[PDB]
Design a protein around this nucleic acid. Structure first.
Ligand SMILES: [Mn+2]
Ligand SMILES: [Mn+2]
Length: 276
DNA sequence: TCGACGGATCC
DNA sequence: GCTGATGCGC
DNA sequence: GGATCCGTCGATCGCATCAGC
């Protein structure tokens, strides 16, 4: 069945108003997404921080519209080191971060422009585009290696500051997180190995699934739909895009949204409200 | 994701 | 710039 | 031996590249 995201809750569990609004979006081709009016949607949402995944766009080719964007003037981009039109992430912020870094510190895993770490006053933001296990599961062996290194990196990071992790984590954690769980247990994104990695990420860092924490029993809430077979119009999709939080920030959590109606990609954007 | 193939296996 | 083919992806 | 089931196994959509010129 179709899904309607509930209204934005903008106070914390103690009624402190939301001070920080982060939006994350796998744009699936940055240039195409801008031509499909993505930035119009971003300007109306007016986030304080905007994280993009799968930009498929070198730093030379970044369209001009992105400079004329003064609510998000501090902009950071990572592209693969030797693979054009593939992967890529960016982070755009209203306020400059204290410190920005690329990758996780493991050469093996830092060649495909997938991770930006931005340290602010009260917390660290990681945005990530996790490697897809691939058709026929060709990259499943590599993904489990990625998962373990990524988990260890985030565990280290969260021991020093509160952590927000957002982005396309390329796994649907539980059967409620996709429309066709039965038909997809040997497919990328829903293998038992990918579901276990997510579980161990939640437990080992530790982190909480912001959206599932607030709506633990809400089905049909998805962030991705394949372009094929008109899946989006039937809401035959997957929840692949997350905000994961240090438990300490759970009392700062106001809401975790899914903007199902914003068009322009095969993912919709997700939006996080925090009281900091 | 879907339909079309199989090759089972029951009524 | 243009065609046609390939890589990638839930 | 005619009908439903049940595991593969191809053809879709969309973006961006590449090879050639
Ligand atoms: Mn994509
Ligand atoms: Mn079946």
């Amino acid at each position: 069945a179709l899904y309607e995201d509930p209204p934005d809750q903008k106070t914390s569990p103690s009624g402190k108003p939301a001070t920080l609004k982060i939006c994350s979006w796998n744009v699936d081709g940055l240039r195409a997404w801008i031509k499909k009016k993505g930035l119009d949607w971003v300007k109306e949402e007016a986030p304080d921080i905007l994280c993009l995944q799968e930009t498929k766009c070198s730093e030379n080719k970044l369209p001009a519209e992105l400079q004329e964007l003064p609510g998000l003037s501090h902009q950071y981009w990572s592209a693969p080191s030797d693979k054009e039109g593939y992967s890529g992430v960016g982070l755009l912020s209203r306020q400059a971060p204290l410190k920005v870094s690329y990758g996780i510190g493991d050469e093996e895993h830092d060649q495909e422009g997938r991770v930006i770490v931005a340290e602010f006053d009260s917390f660290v933001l990681v945005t990530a585009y996790v490697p897809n296990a691939g058709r026929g599961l060709v990259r499943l062996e590599y993904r489990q290696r990625w998962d373990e290194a990524f988990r260890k990196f985030l565990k280290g990071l969260a021991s020093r500051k509160p952590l927000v992790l957002c982005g396309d984590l390329n796994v649907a954690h539980e059967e409620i997180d996709l429309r066709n769980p039965k038909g997809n247990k040997k497919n990328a994104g829903f293998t038992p190995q990918e579901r276990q990695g997510f579980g161990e990420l939640l437990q080992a860092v530790p982190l909480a699934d912001s959206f599932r924490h607030l709506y633990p029993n809400t089905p049909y809430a998805y962030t991705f739909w394949t372009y094929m077979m008109n899946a989006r119009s039937k809401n035959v999709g997957w929840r692949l895009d997350y905000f994961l939080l240090s438990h300490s920030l759970l009392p700062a959590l106001c809401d975790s949204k899914i903007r199902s109606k914003a068009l322009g990609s095969d993912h919709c954007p997700i939006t996080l409200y925090l009281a900091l």
